[PDB]
Amino acid sequence: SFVEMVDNLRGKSGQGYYVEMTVGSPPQTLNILVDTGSSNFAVGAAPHPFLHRYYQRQLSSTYRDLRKGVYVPYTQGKWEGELGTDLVSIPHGPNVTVRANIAAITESDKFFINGSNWEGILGLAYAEIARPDDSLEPFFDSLVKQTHVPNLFSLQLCGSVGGSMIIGGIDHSLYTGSLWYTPIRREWYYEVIIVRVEINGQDLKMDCKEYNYDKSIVDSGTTNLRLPKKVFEAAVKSIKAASSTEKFPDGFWLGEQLVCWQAGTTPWNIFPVISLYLMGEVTNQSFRITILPQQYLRPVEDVSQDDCYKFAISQSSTGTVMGAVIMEGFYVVFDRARKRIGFAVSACHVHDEFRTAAVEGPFVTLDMEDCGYNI
Numbered sequence: 001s002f003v004e005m006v007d008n009l010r011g012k013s014g015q016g017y018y019v020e021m022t023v024g025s026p027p028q029t030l031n032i033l034v035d036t037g038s039s040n041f042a043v044g045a046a047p048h049p050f051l052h053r054y055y056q057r058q059l060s061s062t063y064r065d066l067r068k069g070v071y072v073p074y075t076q077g078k079w080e081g082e083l084g085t086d087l088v089s090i091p092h093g094p095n096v097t098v099r100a101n102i103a104a105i106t107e108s109d110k111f112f113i114n115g116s117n118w119e120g121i122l123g124l125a126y127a128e129i130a131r132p133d134d135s136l137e138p139f140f141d142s143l144v145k146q147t148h149v150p151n152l153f154s155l156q157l158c159g160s161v162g163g164s165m166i167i168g169g170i171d172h173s174l175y176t177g178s179l180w181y182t183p184i185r186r187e188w189y190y191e192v193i194i195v196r197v198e199i200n201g202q203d204l205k206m207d208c209k210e211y212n213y214d215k216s217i218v219d220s221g222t223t224n225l226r227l228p229k230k231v232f233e234a235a236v237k238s239i240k241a242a243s244s245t246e247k248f249p250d251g252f253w254l255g256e257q258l259v260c261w262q263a264g265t266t267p268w269n270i271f272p273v274i275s276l277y278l279m280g281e282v283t284n285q286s287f288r289i290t291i292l293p294q295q296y297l298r299p300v301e302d303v304s305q306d307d308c309y310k311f312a313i314s315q316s317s318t319g320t321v322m323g324a325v326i327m328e329g330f331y332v333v334f335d336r337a338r339k340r341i342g343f344a345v346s347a348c349h350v351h352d353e354f355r356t357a358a359v360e361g362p363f364v365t366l367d368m369e370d371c372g373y374n375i
């Protein structure tokens, strides 16, 4: 009964997506941020100027202490706190209650965001990357272990944003066309292999190794599409040239300055589509997902009569991160059971008059695992 789970997510633009959760007995209600880019369940357990409420272990009859501290750094923010267990539930999700590890956050730096609305984080990636070590069963593993909930989940994230997390199944009412699956290369991050990249139908013609150096992952926790140095540079060059008719600051191409045009006069057609071809389920076979400018140019609210945008492709140097920006076009299936991620066109796709984000296959592509990086 997946309908009870549709629209169970909210967020502000750029500040990630959250699902309502309860902890303890009596139930305590938090907003938890939904992260496929880490493996730890953490909640704020102490005052903070950005926290509107928090978790008070004392008042939970079912708290149990593990007497271990923990520390977790993210790309920018970080937090430390104390590890206990407790009972946990998702009001707008499957009907079960599980005993799960919880990091009680005691102090924190650049983690909570002002007017964030979320109070904790739900790392949905794999034990291998759990902190402090991989013996700390991540929330979702516990759920699968303790219940009958199938080892599968899906995220439909949409363009004051919202979306849905379908726990334990796929909801056909949320996509169109065909699901295409790409193998999970290794169960740590949701790691995948990008085999070909085209901007406006022109191949970047790099060794496909450069697409997955040092990895390529699907990460709801990151907003942007983030590309290795070399790939980022070629991409930018090609987008500078497809839209050289207009001119911008340079902070812009670095995600610093905004750029502006008058309401409705936003010149979409001058920005190229990006196609990322992912490894397929069948030998020599791939598929593509095509990104619209509407995704890689996030809006920002001014501050007044102009529509204004940040460039949402940034540099990386820990590999390619398909952030929310990539994920917004698509219904994304995390088929843990079959070590694959499926992509279909989202029901809440965002519609240019002349061009459209697509999941398309099949393609032929040779020596595809020459594309994976090795240390």
Ligand SMILES: CC(=O)N[C@@H](Cc1cc(F)cc(F)c1)[C@H](O)CNC1(c2cccc(-n3cccn3)c2)CCCCC1
Pocket (backbone or CB within 6 Å): 015, 016, 035, 036, 037, 038, 039, 072, 073, 074, 075, 076, 077, 078, 110, 111, 112, 129, 130, 131, 189, 217, 219, 221, 222, 223, 318, 321
């Ligand atoms: C923006 C941000 O940083 N998002 C957090 C989620 C997030 C969202 C947010 F809004 C504020 C935050 F502080 C953190 C997300 O996991 C980051 N995910 C990566 C990451 C980066 C740094 C550490 C870890 N990691 C931690 C444990 C295991 N791996 C993971 C995954 C590897 C590739 C780079 C991004």
